[PDB]
Amino acid sequence: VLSPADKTNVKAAWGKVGAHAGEYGAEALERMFLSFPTTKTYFPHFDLSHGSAQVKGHGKKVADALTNAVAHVDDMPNALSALSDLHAHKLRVDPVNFKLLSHCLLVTLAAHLPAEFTPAVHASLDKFLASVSTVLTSKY
């Protein structure tokens, strides 16, 4: 459950990401596949080599979905309805994998936006990503 402060931290920080959101999304996935190779089993249709056109393309879709989620953080279930259908109903993704992508996203943001990645912002982003993960992994 996000505080008003948490929501503000996330929105303000994500605004500073901007046009590079697709770049970070791509990099977070690359990190996840390398660090946690069991996550690759969800993308057997992908060529999971480094600099993969599919991974770069998928990163942009993941970033655009996170952007949508941040813009509707007050009511994510309604906003991410089709995405919950995909991940929870169809893919049946194990929640443990969302913790791994979330951590990789935080790693990427810390590396690229160190001035913005304060302790307070870190806290709010981790909390936000955990809420997104619950929504995408729940059948509602």
């Binding site: 008003p4 503000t8 901007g18 007050d74």
Partner: protein, 144 residues
């Protein structure tokens, strides 16, 4: 009984019991889409993220009034709206306590296509950020 203007400190204006969870539906009104843009022509993300879309054009005898729902109301500080160069009066008509949404109103001229927003946020352990320029561009020119 006297509270700060929504212009100067929205987070303080919302404490007014006279507008907490108050009804605010109009007789004659129309939904209107809009975009929030920054100084570099990009989407102004914080404001896009922090506003309810669509907004409402309310028709009155004194001219058209725009109603905008602002999210995380307890974090907003300044929220000044300008039509071109001249400063508009911003009124807080309702605050939704359950979701921290503030609904503000300001009058615009007929055929107004854009409105300028100068605003800031202030919260937590002395966290303060100024948004010197945001352009609220309406999907169509405002009428009635």
């Amino acid at each position: 009984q006297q509270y700060p203007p929504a212009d100067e400190s929205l987070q303080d204006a919302i404490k007014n019991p006279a507008i907490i969870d108050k009804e605010h539906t109009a007789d004659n009104w129309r939904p209107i889409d809009f975009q929030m843009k920054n100084d570099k022509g990009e989407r102004q993300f914080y404001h896009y993220a922090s506003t309810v879309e669509p907004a409402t054009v309310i028709f009155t005898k004194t001219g058209p009034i725009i109603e905008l729902g602002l999210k995380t109301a307890s974090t907003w500080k300044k929220f000044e709206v300008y039509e071109g160069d001249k400063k508009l009066p911003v009124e807080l008509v309702s605050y939704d306590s359950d979701k921290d949404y503030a609904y503000i109103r300001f009058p615009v001229s007929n055929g107004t296509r854009e409105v300028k927003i100068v605003s800031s946020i202030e919260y937590g352990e002395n966290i303060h950020e100024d948004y010197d320029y945001t352009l609220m561009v309406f999907a169509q020119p405002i009428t009635n």
